[PDB]
Design a binder for this molecule. Sequence first.
Ligand SMILES: COC(=O)N[C@H](C(=O)NN(CCC[C@@]1(O)Cc2ccc(cc2)C/C=C\CNC(=O)[C@H](C(C)C)NC1=O)Cc1ccc(-c2cccnc2)cc1)C(C)(C)C
Ligand SMILES: [Cl-]
Ligand SMILES: [Cl-]
Ligand SMILES: [Cl-]
Lengths: 99, 99
Amino acid sequence: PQITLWQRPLVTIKIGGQLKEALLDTGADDTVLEEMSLPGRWKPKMIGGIGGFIKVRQYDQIPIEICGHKAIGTVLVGPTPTNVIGRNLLTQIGCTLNF
Amino acid sequence: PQITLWQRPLVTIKIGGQLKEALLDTGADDTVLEEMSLPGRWKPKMIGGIGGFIKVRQYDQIPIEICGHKAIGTVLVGPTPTNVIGRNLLTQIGCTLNF
Ligand SMILES: COC(=O)N[C@H](C(=O)NN(CCC[C@@]1(O)Cc2ccc(cc2)C/C=C\CNC(=O)[C@H](C(C)C)NC1=O)Cc1ccc(-c2cccnc2)cc1)C(C)(C)C
Ligand SMILES: [Cl-]
Ligand SMILES: [Cl-]
Ligand SMILES: [Cl-]
């Protein structure tokens, strides 16, 4: 698709068999989702946003569909204000910025 | 141009007679820059991101140039860790997400 930016670029993702809404965020290195359960072991990460830092749980090699496009990669889980899809997954689904 | 997302999408902006580097951020409602002077009226605003909120000054009808594309819009100024170009200006230079 081609997504214009007059509204928030909110898309449906699927992760762990569940649908969620998330924001396609080219300003984010990483993908960070609201509290949820994921399988396997997690590692610590501290990520910084415009308001400061939060601690998150890092899960690797997680399957996630984004607008129907299949990706498998790192998903952080923590107290984010919204679900954000960052460049780590945007690159997997072939996203670019164009003007 | 077509801008890849392997790296952070940083560009040069011209604003208030100054050249600055900033991040093209499809996930950001607003454009927010580190402390700088701008002409004209302003009013305070709280904006939120990962980590919570910061207080910024809101300047309206500010001319900006982004990759040689001229636009005008609201620019927020305050203690953001990094300069962000948000959707309010990305629309004006015809920026889209494509995959
Ligand atoms: C490499 O770090 C990151 O990639 N951080 C990212 C990040 O915060 N990146 N930002 C871009 C802004 C992200 C976000 O779009 C993320 C976001 C957050 C909330 C919402 C949408 C999108 C919805 C709620 C309110 C609307 N808020 C916003 O639209 C704000 C804008 C006002 C700025 N939008 C955002 O904050 C830019 C950013 C980059 C680095 C830092 C940073 C650097 C050094 C020390 N501390 C922080 C801070 C901000 C993460 C999402 C992974 C935390
Ligand atoms: Cl990844
Ligand atoms: Cl505006
Ligand atoms: Cl348009």
